[PDB]
Enzyme design. Structure first.
Site, PDB file in Angstrom:
ATOM      1  N   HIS A   1      -6.290  -0.767  32.160  1.00  0.00           N
ATOM      2  CA  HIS A   1      -7.280  -1.789  31.741  1.00  0.00           C
ATOM      3  C   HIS A   1      -6.826  -2.493  30.451  1.00  0.00           C
ATOM      4  CE1 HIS A   1      -9.802   1.321  29.458  1.00  0.00           C
ATOM      5  NE2 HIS A   1      -9.548   0.362  28.591  1.00  0.00           N
ATOM      6  N   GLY A  53     -11.216   0.550  20.996  1.00  0.00           N
ATOM      7  CA  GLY A  53      -9.855   0.708  20.476  1.00  0.00           C
ATOM      8  C   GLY A  53      -9.308   2.105  20.700  1.00  0.00           C
ATOM      9  N   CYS A  87      -9.227   3.840  23.568  1.00  0.00           N
ATOM     10  CA  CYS A  87      -8.683   4.092  24.901  1.00  0.00           C
ATOM     11  C   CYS A  87      -7.198   4.392  24.756  1.00  0.00           C
ATOM     12  CB  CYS A  87      -8.957   2.956  25.872  1.00  0.00           C
ATOM     13  SG  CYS A  87     -10.733   2.726  26.166  1.00  0.00           S
TER      14      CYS A  87
END
Ligand SMILES: CS(=O)(=O)Cc1nc2ccccc2[nH]1
Ligand SMILES: CS(=O)(=O)Cc1nc2ccccc2[nH]1
Lengths: 304, 304
Positions: free
Chosen positions: B41, B143, B145
């Site tokens: 993603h 932030g 991830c």
């Protein structure tokens, strides 16, 4: 979202841990520049710990009696001195992994990370607070002495604790990195009882703000209080008195949430008087006091 | 003595964290050998996350669109591929700090350490469990991830988790390092509700053993039970069924303490039925389930 008891990343401190052996005693040392810091009780037998005369015991020790091992490599000891309750072993090699660092003496209620070590090898990291009775509630087995406590501000490690002692009640005592014990404790195997382990009120309030930020809101009520009224209740529940300095420190969380500090005090007052009634806040059934206001801001804003 | 929620030392993983940017999206990647692993993603806008077609979005991406930064130094991307929900960015430099490592897919109830990162920089470390509903209860802001979960066995890092998603209920979902989600979760901003967050019974029993080892003994009672009787009570309280495999895993703690597993089950049964009555166990007012039997042995024996 989510709020965890979070330690600082430990790598900068891992690179400083060494093994120190004197005779049959092995514990941990902290290698910064060309000095290794360790508890002076490395020189004691268990027998010695009953009534040690450190100056007298130290006379029988030479540089070559302090075996310092960094990983599987031996460091050469070229000097030693006692400072308060720590030994400073001067070695002939500066630690190549020495981070930017400071030695700081923290106040009760301040939190820090502990890197628990055995034989100079890191086993785990966890978050501690300096209790109001100057103990910490750690996780320390035989061999963990010389494990350290620290905070990190970006790339500077502030060392604040070195592990020395377990009290008969299974709580922990140690020194700053100048070798001064926190609180009244001594490095002798004697009757040392801790005082009242009071709750760190400013930290509880910080954590209630954390709870609101993270959507735990059930405990918010329609009440306010005053510092004096709140403090009558704190005293009854063995909470630390809340000062205007604490209210000032909570100002940024108050601003972020729009909940006045004294309104959060009145929420805490009701929680103390009424209990949790089987409810939880951020996954806890008791009021958590090992987050500082700075910890809450840091974790809620994602500081690296 | 003392028993803490302890993370693994994080240094070996700190040395693997990088920043990955694609267009306006920045998150974390894991740099092992000459591959950087990150959530797929990274290629999405917030708009894209509503109904992303990852294969279609990826066609518009070239190697030079994946900006990978290790500290303040840029890595050259010489290939990319999608594996399940992760991207593998091949870089022209092997990570010089790559530890011995494995990728492992853990089972619900297994614990691990998370190194929370932002912009490729470590912020904190904490201990998690894979919940029975395949969520984790983390601490993750925008932030974070690509932050990872891991266990260490001496010098080998077993990576088991990479952070992808927060559910609307503020619990967390992610993948193993082959990019397969734990549980039913998907990398889309959609209605994804977690199932029952049941208690990890074998872990509670491990922690009760930890409590006895560390002198918390008030909850020990004069009773025993059977697995079937215990399980009738577990079911009622949304505890996981206890199996003979779990009893076998608890054998070493049973042996160390001399408390039969089924006697500790009967202690747990009374705690479930009677509650804590305002008492604490190892500083907790609820029954802690994020220590495995292996965690308890490790921490009680001081493994490095
Ligand atoms: C302590 S010393 O040997 O006097 C000077 C020093 N300090 C250092 C720290 C890291 C690397 C080399 C270093 N040389
Ligand atoms: C991944 S690679 O470039 O194909 C081979 C490699 N892997 C390494 C790991 C650490 C240091 C040098 C290393 N060279």
């Amino acid at each position: 979202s989510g709020f965890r008891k979070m330690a600082f990343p430990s790598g900068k401190v891992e690179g400083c841990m060494v093994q120190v052996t004197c005779g049959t005693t092995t514990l941990n040392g902290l290698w910064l520049d060309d000095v290794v810091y360790c508890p002076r009780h490395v020189i004691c037998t268990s027998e010695d710990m009953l009534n040690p005369n450190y100056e007298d015991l130290l006379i029988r020790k030479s540089n070559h009696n302090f075996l310092v091992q960094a990983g599987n490599v031996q460091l050469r000891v070229i000097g030693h001195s006692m400072q308060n309750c720590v030994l400073k072993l001067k070695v002939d090699t500066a630690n190549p992994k020495t981070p930017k660092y400071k030695f700081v003496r923290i106040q009760p209620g301040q939190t820090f990370s502990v890197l628990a070590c055995y034989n100079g090898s890191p086993s785990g990291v966890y978050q501690c607070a300096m209790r109001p009775n100057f103990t910490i509630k750690g996780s320390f087995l035989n061999g963990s002495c010389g494990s350290v406590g620290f905070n990190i501000d970006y790339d500077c490690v502030s060392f604040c604790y070195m592990h020395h002692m377990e009290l008969p009640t299974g709580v922990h005592a140690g020194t700053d990195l100048e070798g001064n014990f926190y609180g009244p404790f001594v490095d002798r195997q004697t009757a040392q009882a801790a005082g009242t382990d009071t709750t760190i009120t400013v930290n509880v309030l910080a954590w209630l703000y954390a709870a609101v930020i993270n959507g735990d809101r059930w405990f918010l009520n329609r009440f306010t209080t005053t510092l004096n009224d709140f403090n009558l209740v704190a005293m009854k529940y063995n909470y630390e008195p809340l000062t205007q300095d604490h209210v000032d420190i909570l100002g940024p969380l108050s601003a972020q949430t729009g909940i006045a500090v004294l309104d959060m005090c009145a929420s805490l007052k009701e929680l103390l008087q009424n209990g949790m009634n089987g409810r939880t806040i951020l996954g806890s059934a008791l009021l958590e006091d090992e987050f500082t206001p700075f910890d809450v801001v840091r974790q809620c804003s994602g500081v690296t």
